[PDB]
Ligand binder design. Sequence first.
Ligand SMILES: *[C@@H]1O[C@H](CO)[C@@H](O[C@@H]2O[C@H](CO)[C@@H](O)[C@H](O)[C@H]2NC(C)=O)[C@H](O)[C@H]1NC(C)=O
Ligand SMILES: *[C@@H]1O[C@H](CO)[C@@H](O[C@@H]2O[C@H](CO)[C@@H](O)[C@H](O)[C@H]2NC(C)=O)[C@H](O)[C@H]1NC(C)=O
Ligand SMILES: *[C@@H]1O[C@H](CO)[C@@H](O[C@@H]2O[C@H](CO)[C@@H](O)[C@H](O)[C@H]2NC(C)=O)[C@H](O)[C@H]1NC(C)=O
Ligand SMILES: *[C@@H]1O[C@H](CO)[C@@H](O)[C@H](O)[C@H]1NC(C)=O
Lengths: 431, 438
Amino acid sequence: SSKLQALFAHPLYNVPEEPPLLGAEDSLLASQEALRYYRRKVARWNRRHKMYREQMDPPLQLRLEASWVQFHLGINRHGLYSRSSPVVSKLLQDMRHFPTISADYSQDEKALLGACDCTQIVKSGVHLKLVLRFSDFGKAMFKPMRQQRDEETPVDFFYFIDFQRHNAEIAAFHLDRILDFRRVPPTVGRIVNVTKEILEVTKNEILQSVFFVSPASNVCFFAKCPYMCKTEYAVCGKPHLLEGSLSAFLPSLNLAPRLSVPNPWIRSYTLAGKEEWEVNPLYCDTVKQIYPYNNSQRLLNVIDMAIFDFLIGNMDRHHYEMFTKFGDDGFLIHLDNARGFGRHSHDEISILSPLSQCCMIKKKTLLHLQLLAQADYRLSDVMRESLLEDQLSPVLTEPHLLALDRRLQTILRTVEGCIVAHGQQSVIVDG
Amino acid sequence: SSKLQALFAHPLYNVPEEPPLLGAEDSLLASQEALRYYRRKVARWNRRHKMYREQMNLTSLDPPLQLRLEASWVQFHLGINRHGLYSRSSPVVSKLLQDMRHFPTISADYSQDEKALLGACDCTQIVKPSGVHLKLVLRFSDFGKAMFKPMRQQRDEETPVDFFYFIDFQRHNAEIAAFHLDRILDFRRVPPTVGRIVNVTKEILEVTKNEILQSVFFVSPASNVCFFAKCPYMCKTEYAVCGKPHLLEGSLSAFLPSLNLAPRLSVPNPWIRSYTLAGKEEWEVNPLYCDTVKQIYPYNNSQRLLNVIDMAIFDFLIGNMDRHHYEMFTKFGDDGFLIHLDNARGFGRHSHDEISILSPLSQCCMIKKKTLLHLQLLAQADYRLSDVMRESLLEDQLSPVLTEPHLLALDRRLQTILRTVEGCIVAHGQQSVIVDGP
Ligand SMILES: *[C@@H]1O[C@H](CO)[C@@H](O[C@@H]2O[C@H](CO)[C@@H](O)[C@H](O)[C@H]2NC(C)=O)[C@H](O)[C@H]1NC(C)=O
Ligand SMILES: *[C@@H]1O[C@H](CO)[C@@H](O[C@@H]2O[C@H](CO)[C@@H](O)[C@H](O)[C@H]2NC(C)=O)[C@H](O)[C@H]1NC(C)=O
Ligand SMILES: *[C@@H]1O[C@H](CO)[C@@H](O[C@@H]2O[C@H](CO)[C@@H](O)[C@H](O)[C@H]2NC(C)=O)[C@H](O)[C@H]1NC(C)=O
Ligand SMILES: *[C@@H]1O[C@H](CO)[C@@H](O)[C@H](O)[C@H]1NC(C)=O
């Protein structure tokens, strides 16, 4: 049969989560306050669109049944979305097929225009990404596939280039759903007509002016400051179609503010020989006494994030984000996973340092990992099966999929080492 | 006597550098092209100053400003050449250090990279590492500009999002000490930097024309003068510094030439991260990575890799794990020297040595003859590195810049560098390790 189907039909993936949601205080957004805010933004956009089109059709209406609207209203204390959620399935399909009505630069990149300084340009930064708006007024971050070879980007160092960038965003969401972490925004691949769906729908004159026709008769747009800095500066359709990743927008920071928190294990340190850094508990013994890691949930949430990052080989989680409303102990949002799935033949166990030093793990997390190590629910099999739904299938080649099984075994062997040293009662925390 | 004096009187610190400078093509700026550009900026600044002083109703007292060629910062810019930012035993640098330390200010503003983050507050672009928020760019009476980084004052209880062991407590001391070590090592690759106790009321608030910077000044409940950053405050990170009640200590770093006159490139550091190799070969000892980097442009040419190895030695000595990128001048091409900017993350742990920073040296096993000779000399008792550093730092207004543990760690890390070179020589011989210069 189907291992992916077997996984979500398994009793483990149907256990109700504790504590059950108590309605109001457990949801991110207040429905009535958020809906009137979205209705004002829609009226704003229709006002902008009416004046623009007159300078050169019926208006847009905010429909409550839109996928992204239910997505935002579905965000609660237990994660970004629900397990086996039909709303998520519809949102993935909507992002893949709905036409676009507007396109612009990301807000953080409108600043670097520019006034070109290569310091703020060669920072994990995807400078050719764009924000697309769909016909249902939803917004997604479009990260195009890396196309230029490093000979065209003299400043870029080969082994730091995000060649797998768009595949990594897609595969990180599917792994998030399979792990039942439910902490990264829904993400799909899409083959985009850059002429029809970007150039002809944007109101940004700067973005209009950077589009050009390649000498090879392809349609392209470029970034001026990255070109002068000799980094990645252009992507092209062939001649119109360009594949990339689309990541669903979280609610506006006006509705749900977010904090950025530094990852205390982003760096490893060479301890005085020959005690290894990932195995020595002194560092986590100190972090356990430092707010906000003194409470159990926060440290266990970071350990979840390190397991996720180890599985995808992401060494670039310098910071994690949280929603203000859920306070401490709230779940961590796993955003911007474009640096994952870059090295299938190398495992950076220093990423697992929170688990190997603190020697504690969620019971739920360990049970899901133990199940995904069994042949009937093999992580690489259910991942390969899940990624077949995407327009850019297979998204992940076989080496990356098989590396998931190897890194999963390493996580489980690490837990065994903790249990030998401290016993199951100390290691496996309950909720 | 004086060990610092003995060091620069030593024959090693008086060897002419090869190849000798050929004047024009070896200088960064063309004097006549650069001087007329500065004269236009001065005329621009005088136009704004007359017009501004009228909008806020202030009598246009005092005569206008004149671009004087003999200004320290002007000669500094014209002195930049293919061999470094400044000359060895340079009286121009000594004067520039004194001018930054004593000259009054005439204008103050935000840095351009932070004028962008005045939004639209997003904590992602605010809590990034290596970022020094609340820093300001000051303009002096001789029209020169310096980056003022104020001392970190708030404890981590006031910054709940900040992780204790990542806080830049030594931030202003690190910028100062990194320049003094740069001069003592004769790398001459970081901009001149001094400490200064600044009256934030007279020399920042009362000279700025930026209304946003004006509005963020306030009086502390303890009757201190303070200014704050709104977006960092909402992000629960470091957001305010204060005089006590007016005076605030910080670091001042001299501006490089405008990117219009001398464009710069930022290049990623291939050794910014270490990796756990499949057992049981250690990362710092395995040469395969550098064997591959040696085949990757622009590290195939000898000068570039040797310059990176110099930068790793420097970063190891000051314990800076945050050199994600290095900068170069466009005009000097690939073989040009590397600029060692933004050293605020150094000198943070006197009791730990991160040998992974030395990885380029321990993997590639090659070093400049000049670099190795200077290190060997600074390890001798008569020229002891901690002694000449302590002596050099006494010139600064914020003396002592480095406490004794940091100074003694310089000697300990120097021994590790030289003992690392010994390991390379055992494996490959002096001929392979010690490279000579063209
Ligand atoms: C991508 O979109 C462009 C523009 O909508 C399409 O090119 C147009 O094709 C029609 C005929 O089908 C012509 O009348 C237009 O003049 C064309 N415009 C341009 C700018 O060439 C293109 O066919 C689309 N490619 C797809 C859908 O694969
Ligand atoms: C973790 O530490 C924080 C702060 O140190 C605790 O939060 C508050 O701490 C102060 C004193 O440190 C108390 O007066 C408050 O009552 C605490 N807030 C509460 C209890 O909500 C926090 O409680 C610590 N974690 C745990 C599990 O106690
Ligand atoms: C720092 O600058 C302030 C502002 O110029 C100086 O304070 C001024 O001088 C005297 C001292 O209080 C007062 O009569 C003025 O009214 C002050 N002006 C303002 C705006 O407060 C101060 O003396 C300077 N030096 C120190 C050490 O604070
Ligand atoms: C380094 O490699 C580049 C490859 O483009 C070549 O042009 C250059 O001449 C090489 N220089 C040296 C010194 O090997």
